[PDB]
């Protein structure tokens, strides 16, 4: 949908002690459909990591307007990919232990606690 490829994030992290980087420390490979989404935002990589999967997602809700009120409780979609991963027309920001569990399913990895397989292909400019 857009891109702009002028963003390369070192010392700037989220995190949260709820779901921190110590339980999801894993490489991603780009896939799926979870990762098509920051794809257009703002990440040109090879290949990312679980913690930074969360920190292009926050970005593209803070510049685009989505959660704007005085009483904070749900947000609000405007007819976009955001809600074709999770599948519900509005979601709490606020709660870690909803959102992390859906990027569970819809994502692919590398090292793994059970024998599986997925693939093999890579992206970049
Ligand atoms: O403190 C807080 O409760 C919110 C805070 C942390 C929040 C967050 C951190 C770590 C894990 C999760 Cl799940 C969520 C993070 C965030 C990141 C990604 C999404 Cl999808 C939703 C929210 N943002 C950025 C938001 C747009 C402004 C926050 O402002």
Same mark, same amino acid.
């Given at each position: 949908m857009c891109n702009t490829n002028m963003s390369v994030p070192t010392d700037g992290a989220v995190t949260t002690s709820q779901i921190p980087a *110590? !339980?999801?420390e894993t490489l991603v490979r780009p896939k799926p459909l +979870? +990762?098509?989404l920051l794809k257009s935002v703002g990440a040109q990589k090879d290949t990312y990591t679980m913690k930074e999967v969360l920190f292009y997602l926050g970005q593209y809700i803070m510049?685009?307007?989505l959660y704007d009120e005085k009483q904070q409780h $749900? &947000?609000?979609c405007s007819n976009d990919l955001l809600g074709d991963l999770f599948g &519900?027309? *509005?979601? #709490?920001?606020? !709660?870690?232990?909803? $959102?992390y569990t859906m990027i569970y399913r819809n994502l692919v990895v590398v090292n793994q606690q059970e *024998? #599986?397989? *997925?693939?093999t292909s890579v992206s970049e400019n």
């Open positions: *110590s !339980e999801q +979870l +990762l098509k510049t685009k307007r $749900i &947000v609000y &519900v027309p *509005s979601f #709490s920001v606020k !709660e870690h232990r909803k $959102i *024998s #599986s397989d *997925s693939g």
